[PDB]
Design a protein around this ligand. Structure first.
Ligand SMILES: N=C(N)c1cccc(O[C@H]2CO[C@H]3[C@@H]2OC[C@H]3Oc2cccc(C(=N)N)c2)c1
Ligand SMILES: [Ca+2]
Length: 223
């Protein structure tokens, strides 16, 4: 997260870290047994880390649970990141508490201009590199589809939306991928892709979760 702020420990209780010996992507807890992330975060050997603030220090509220199954969206296209969504089942149910909590799925898509909360442990610099150990947060509005598609002609599908600031300065970044965009209490986006981080006229691109709620619900109920 570039241009954001330290969230505060466990203030984003649905945020998970995906760990394969190291943090490599975010995710969102949607019930005690399932996490939603980005398909481009797929790998085998995932451990889900819940209750995290400092990902390098055991602070006392963590739950570390191995993934038992990963399900990449059937239509994920790795060249274009169209349908950049994946489900991860936990080998054992998380113990839900005030620091380890699910986020609701949308019942409808969110409209342009709605303010959202984006969070993660990604790079915090727009030139160069600095990775935080505590969770970072950013408030950012959903941008119009026209502004999104103007920034990335040819590359935005109906399964994507842009959020952030055309002036630059404030964006998600490498290492935030797979993490949440929460708007009005609903998981509306997944950190997916962009051009650099926090550059002028190149807002972040997010998987449009409202298009996937039927697939999510049917998939989890059958697995
Ligand atoms: N600035 C950001 N908000 C952001 C967030 C996550 C990742 C990120 O950058 C990485 C760099 O490599 C990946 C992801 O962003 C770009 C590329 O994926 C795509 C996706 C869709 C189309 C194509 C394409 N070039 N045709 C590339 C930045
Ligand atoms: Ca920790």
């Amino acid at each position: 997260i570039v241009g954001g702020y330290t969230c505060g420990a466990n203030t984003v209780p649905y945020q998970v870290s995906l760990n394969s010996g190291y943090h490599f992507c975010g995710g969102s807890l949607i019930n005690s047994q399932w996490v939603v992330s980005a398909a481009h975060c797929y790998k085998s050997g995932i451990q889900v880390r819940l209750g995290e603030d400092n990902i390098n220090v055991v602070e006392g509220n963590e739950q570390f649970i191995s993934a038992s199954k990963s399900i990449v969206h059937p239509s994920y296209n790795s060249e274009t990141y169209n349908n950049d969504i994946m489900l991860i089942k936990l080998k054992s149910a998380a113990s839900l508490n005030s620091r380890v909590a699910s986020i609701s799925l949308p019942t409808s898509c969110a409209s342009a201009g709605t303010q959202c909360l984006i969070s993660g442990w990604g790079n915090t610099k727009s030139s160069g590199t600095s990775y935080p150990d505590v969770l970072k947060c950013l408030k950012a509005p959903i941008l119009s589809d026209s502004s999104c598609k103007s920034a990335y002609p040819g590359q935005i599908t109906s399964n994507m939306f842009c959020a952030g600031y055309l002036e630059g300065g404030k964006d998600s970044c490498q290492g935030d991928s797979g993490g949440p965009v929460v708007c009005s209490g609903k998981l509306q986006g997944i950190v997916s892709w962009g051009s650099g981080c926090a550059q002028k006229n190149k807002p972040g691109v997010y998987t449009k979760v409202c298009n996937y709620v039927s697939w999510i619900k049917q998939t989890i109920a059958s697995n």
